[PDB]
Amino acid sequence: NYFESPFRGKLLSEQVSNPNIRVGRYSYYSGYYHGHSFDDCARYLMPDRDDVDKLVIGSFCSIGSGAAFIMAGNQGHRAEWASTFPFHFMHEEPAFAGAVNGYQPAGDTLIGHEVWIGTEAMFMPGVRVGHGAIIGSRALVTGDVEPYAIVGGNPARTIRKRFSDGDIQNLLEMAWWDWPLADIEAAMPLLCTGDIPALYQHWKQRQA
Amino acid sequence: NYFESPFRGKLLSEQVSNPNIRVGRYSYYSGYYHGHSFDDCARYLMPDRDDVDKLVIGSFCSIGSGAAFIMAGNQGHRAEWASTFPFHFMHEEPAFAGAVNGYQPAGDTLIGHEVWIGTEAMFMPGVRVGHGAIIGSRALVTGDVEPYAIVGGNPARTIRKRFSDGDIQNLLEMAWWDWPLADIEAAMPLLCTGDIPALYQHWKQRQA
Amino acid sequence: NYFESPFRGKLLSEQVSNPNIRVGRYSYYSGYYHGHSFDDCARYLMPDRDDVDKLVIGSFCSIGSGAAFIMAGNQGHRAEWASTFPFHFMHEEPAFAGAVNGYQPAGDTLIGHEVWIGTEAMFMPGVRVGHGAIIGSRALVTGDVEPYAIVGGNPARTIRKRFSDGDIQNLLEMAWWDWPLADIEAAMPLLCTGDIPALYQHWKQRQA
Ligand SMILES: CCNC(=O)CCNC(=O)[C@H](O)C(C)(C)COP(=O)(O)OP(=O)(O)OC[C@H]1O[C@@H](n2cnc3c(N)ncnc32)[C@H](O)[C@@H]1OP(=O)(O)O
Ligand SMILES: CCNC(=O)CCNC(=O)[C@H](O)C(C)(C)COP(=O)(O)OP(=O)(O)OC[C@H]1O[C@@H](n2cnc3c(N)ncnc32)[C@H](O)[C@@H]1OP(=O)(O)O
Numbered sequence: 001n002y003f004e005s006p007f008r009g010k011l012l013s014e015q016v017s018n019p020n021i022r023v024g025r026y027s028y029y030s031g032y033y034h035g036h037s038f039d040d041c042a043r044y045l046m047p048d049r050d051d052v053d054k055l056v057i058g059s060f061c062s063i064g065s066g067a068a069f070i071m072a073g074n075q076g077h078r079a080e081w082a083s084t085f086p087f088h089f090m091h092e093e094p095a096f097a098g099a100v101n102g103y104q105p106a107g108d109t110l111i112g113h114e115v116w117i118g119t120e121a122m123f124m125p126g127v128r129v130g131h132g133a134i135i136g137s138r139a140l141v142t143g144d145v146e147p148y149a150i151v152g153g154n155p156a157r158t159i160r161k162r163f164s165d166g167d168i169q170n171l172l173e174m175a176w177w178d179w180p181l182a183d184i185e186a187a188m189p190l191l192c193t194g195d196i197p198a199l200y201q202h203w204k205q206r207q208a
Numbered sequence: 209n210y211f212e213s214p215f216r217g218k219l220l221s222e223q224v225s226n227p228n229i230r231v232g233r234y235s236y237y238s239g240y241y242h243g244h245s246f247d248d249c250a251r252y253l254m255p256d257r258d259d260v261d262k263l264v265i266g267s268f269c270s271i272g273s274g275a276a277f278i279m280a281g282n283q284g285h286r287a288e289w290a291s292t293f294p295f296h297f298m299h300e301e302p303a304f305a306g307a308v309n310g311y312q313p314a315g316d317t318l319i320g321h322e323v324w325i326g327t328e329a330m331f332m333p334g335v336r337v338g339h340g341a342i343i344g345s346r347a348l349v350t351g352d353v354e355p356y357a358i359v360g361g362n363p364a365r366t367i368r369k370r371f372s373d374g375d376i377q378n379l380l381e382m383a384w385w386d387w388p389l390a391d392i393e394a395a396m397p398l399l400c401t402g403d404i405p406a407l408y409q410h411w412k413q414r415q416a
Numbered sequence: 417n418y419f420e421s422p423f424r425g426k427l428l429s430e431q432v433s434n435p436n437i438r439v440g441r442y443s444y445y446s447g448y449y450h451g452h453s454f455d456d457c458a459r460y461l462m463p464d465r466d467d468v469d470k471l472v473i474g475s476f477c478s479i480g481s482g483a484a485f486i487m488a489g490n491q492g493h494r495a496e497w498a499s500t501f502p503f504h505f506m507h508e509e510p511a512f513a514g515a516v517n518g519y520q521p522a523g524d525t526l527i528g529h530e531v532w533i534g535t536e537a538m539f540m541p542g543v544r545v546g547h548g549a550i551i552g553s554r555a556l557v558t559g560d561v562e563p564y565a566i567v568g569g570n571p572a573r574t575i576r577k578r579f580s581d582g583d584i585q586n587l588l589e590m591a592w593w594d595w596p597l598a599d600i601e602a603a604m605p606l607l608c609t610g611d612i613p614a615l616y617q618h619w620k621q622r623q624a
C-alpha cells in the first residue's frame with residue numbers, strides 16, 4: 001500500500017507524476033483504502049500527449065480515498081452516430097479501416113481552491129468545481145459546481161451553499177488561498193471560525 | 209494487472225471463461241483500472257451449474273472498467289419471510305437444519321447489441337438492456353432499459369433516447385450488428401454519421 | 417484473497433479485530449469480490465483509542481461484499497468554518513501551528529439485528545439502521561433507517577417496508593434474534609414464511 005495509514009495522506013505535489021496533472025500547494029490525497037498513488041486517480045489521462053484535457057487542482061484541497069476523475073473526453077465513442085462502437089480504434093480488424101476517429105476533447109477538468117472531495121466521488125469529463133465547494137462521498141459530478149456549494153448524489157446535486165451569498169462574495173474577494181503563508185498564519189485564528197465578516201476586516205486592515 | 213494500458217482493452221471472447229457467460233463478437237472490456245479479467249465482472253455466477261441464470265452479452269458492446277453484473281438471483285435471501293437470514297445455507301450450525309432454501313432465480317441478464325456501459329456501472333439480477341442503450345458511469349440499473357435509451361443514476365433513469373422513435377425503428381429493422389462483416393465495411397462511412405435515414409437507404413439498396 | 421469463494425462468507429466474530437467493532441452472533445460478511453477482511457470495512461476506525469465512535473452490528477446480519485462504514489465523524493473538516501482544510505492536522509508545517517482541532521465525533525454507527533446490506537453499500541458516520549431493514553446495493557445511507565424499511569439509492573431512500581405496521585410491531589415484540597437457539601430451531605418452520613401472525617402465536621404459546 002502506497003499509504004501507511006488511513007489517518008495520514010500524502011501531498012499531491014509529492015506523488016503526482018503525469019505531466020498533465022497540475023496540483024497546487026498543500027493540496028493532498030489520502031487513499032490508503034485504495035492503495036494507489038494519486039496518479040491513477042486521473043483515469044485515461046495520457047502523460048505522453050499535450051493536446052489533451054488536463055486535470056487541474058487548486059490549492060488546499062483535501063481529496064478523499066478512491067476519488068476519480070474520468071478523462072479523455074468521449075474516448076472515441078459518439079452517442080449521436082449510428083453506432084457507439086470505436087471502430088477506428090480496433091486497428092487490428094481491416095474491415096474497420098476507413099473508420100473515422102470519433103474522439104473529441106471535453107476541456108480541462110478544473111478543481112478550484114479549498115475543495116473537499118469525499119471518498120469515492122467521481123467527476124465526469126470537463127466539469128469545473130468552484131472554490132470551497134464540498135463534494136459529497138460517492139457523489140457523481142455531471143457538471144459545474146458553484147463556489148461554496150455542497151453537492152452529493154448520483155447524479156450530484158447542490159444540497160446548499162456553505163455561506164451567505166454576501167459572505168461568499170467576500171471570501172472570493174480576499175482569496176486567502178493566494179495569501180503569503182505568513183499572512184495565513186496571521187489570520188489563522190480567524191480561519192478557524194465561521195466569521196467571514198471578521199476575517200474580511202482583518203484582511204482589509206492588514207492590506208494597509 | 210490483466211491489462212497493459214488504460215487505453216486498450218481486450219475482447220470478451222478472449223478472456224471470458226465461465227461457461228455461463230455468452231459473449232458476442234467484437235464486444236470488449238477495458239478494465240485496467242480494476243485489474244481483473246471480465247470473468248470476475250459476473251458476480252456470483254457459478255460455472256459449475258447449468259440450472260442458473262446466465263449473463264448474455266450481445267455484439268459490438270463496449271464495457272467500461274469495473275462494470276459489474278450481480279447474479280445468483282436473490283442469493284437465498286427472502287425479504288418477504290420473517291427473516292432475511294440464509295439459515296438453510298449455514299450448514300455448519302445444526303439448529304438451522306430444517307431451514308428451507310429460499311433461493312430463487314431471476315432470469316438471464318441480457319445485454320443487447322451495441323451497448324455502451326460506463327466504467328463502474330452495476331446491473332441488478334434479471335435486468336435486460338436493449339440494443340444501443342447507453343449506460344451512464346456508476347449507473348445502478350434496477351430494471352429493463354429501452355433500445356437506444358440513455359440511462360444513469362442510482363437508481364438508473366432514462367435521460368433520453370439516442371435517436372428518433374422512427375430512426376430507432378429503422379435501426380432495429382436493419383440490425384447492422386448481424387450484418388456480414390463485408391457489408392459492415394461497406395456501410396462504414398455511413399456508420400460514422402447520425403444519418404439513420406441515409407444508412408437505411410444504403411441498406412435497402414444493397415439488400416437488392 | 418481472504419475468501420475462498422464468492423459463495424461462502426465468514427462470520428464477523430471470526431475476522432473482526434478492531435476493538436471498536438462489536439459484532440453479534442451469526443452475523444457475517446462475504447467479501448470475496450473485495451478480498452479484504454471485515455476489519456477494513458470500518459473506514460478510519462482507530463483501534464487505539466476508546467474515545468471514538470464505534471461500529472456496532474447486531475445479530476443475524478448478512479453483509480454484502482464491499483460494504484463500507486465511514487467513521488471518524490468529520491475527520492477534522494468543518495464545512496462551517498472559513499476553510500475546510502485540516503490545518504491542525506498538518507503538523508509538519510509551522511505556519512499551521514495555532515490551528516485549532518476541528519474534529520468532532522458523530523456518535524456510534526448502529527446496525528440493528530437481521531440487517532441485510534447489499535454489496536457495496538456505504539454508510540455515513542453516525543447513522544443508525546433499524547432491525548430487519550434491507551439496504552440496497554450501492555445505496556448511500558445518509559441517515560437513520562426504520563426497522564423493516566427497504567432503502568436504496570444515492571442518497572438512500574425508503575422504497576417500502578417489509579411488513580405491515582402491525583406485523584412489524586409484533587416482530588419487534590418477540591425479538592426472535594434474542595431467542596435461545598433452541599427456540600429458534602423450534603420456530604424455524606415458521607421463520608421461513610411471511611406469516612408473522614402465525615409466528616407471533618407460536619411465540620406467545622411457547623412463552624407459556
Ligand atoms: C475523506 C473521506 N471523507 C468523506 O467522504 C466525508 C465527506 N462528507 C460528506 O460527503 C457529507 O455527507 C456531507 C458534508 C455532504 C454531509 O453534510 P451535512 O451533515 O451538512 O448533510 P446533512 O447530514 O445535514 O444532510 C443534509 C442533506 O444532505 C444529504 N447528503 C449528505 N451527504 C450526502 C452525499 N454524500 N450525497 C448526497 N446527499 C448527501 C442528506 O441526504 C440530507 O438531506 P435529506 O434528509 O433531505 O435527504
Ligand atoms: C469506458 C469509461 N467511460 C465512461 O464511463 C463514460 C460514459 N459516459 C457517460 O456515462 C456520460 O455521462 C453520458 C453519455 C450519459 C453523458 O452524456 P450527455 O453529455 O448527453 O449528458 P449531458 O452532459 O447532456 O447531461 C444530460 C443529463 O445527463 C445526466 N447524466 C450524465 N451522465 C450521467 C450519469 N452517469 N448518471 C446519471 N445522469 C447522468 C446529467 O445530469 C444531465 O442533466 P441535468 O443537468 O438535468 O442534471
Ligand SMILES: CCNC(=O)CCNC(=O)[C@H](O)C(C)(C)COP(=O)(O)OP(=O)(O)OC[C@H]1O[C@@H](n2cnc3c(N)ncnc32)[C@H](O)[C@@H]1OP(=O)(O)O
Nearest residue numbers: 332350362363480481534535551552553554555568569575
Ligand atoms: C450480497 C450481495 N447482494 C446484493 O447486493 C443484493 C441486494 N438486493 C437489493 O439491494 C435489491 O435491489 C432490492 C432487495 C432492494 C430489490 O428488491 P425489490 O425487487 O422488491 O425492488 P423492485 O425490483 O420491486 O423494485 C422496486 C423499486 O426498488 C428500486 N430499487 C431496487 N433496488 C434498488 C437499489 N439498490 N437502490 C435503489 N433503488 C432500488 C427500483 O428502482 C424500484 O422502483 P421504480 O421502478 O419506481 O424505479
Ligand SMILES: O=C(N[C@H](CO)[C@H](O)c1ccc([N+](=O)[O-])cc1)C(Cl)Cl
Nearest residue numbers: 044072075076089214215216217238
Ligand atoms: O480499448 C479501447 N478503448 C477503451 C475505451 O472503450 C480505452 O479505455 C480507451 C480510452 C480512451 C481512448 N482515447 O480517448 O484515446 C482510447 C481508448 C479501444 Cl482501443 Cl477498443
Ligand SMILES: O=C(N[C@H](CO)[C@H](O)c1ccc([N+](=O)[O-])cc1)C(Cl)Cl
Nearest residue numbers: 252280283284297422423424425446
Ligand atoms: O456466505 C453465504 N452467502 C453469501 C450471500 O449472503 C454468498 O455470497 C452466496 C451467494 C449466492 C449463493 N447462492 O445464491 O447460491 C449462496 C451464497 C451463506 Cl453460505 Cl452464509
Ligand SMILES: O=C(N[C@H](CO)[C@H](O)c1ccc([N+](=O)[O-])cc1)C(Cl)Cl
Nearest residue numbers: 006007008009030460488491492505
Ligand atoms: O491526511 C490527513 N487527513 C485524512 C482525512 O483528510 C486522514 O484520512 C484522516 C482521517 C481521520 C482523522 N481523524 O478524524 O482523526 C485524521 C486524518 C491529515 Cl493528517 Cl492531512
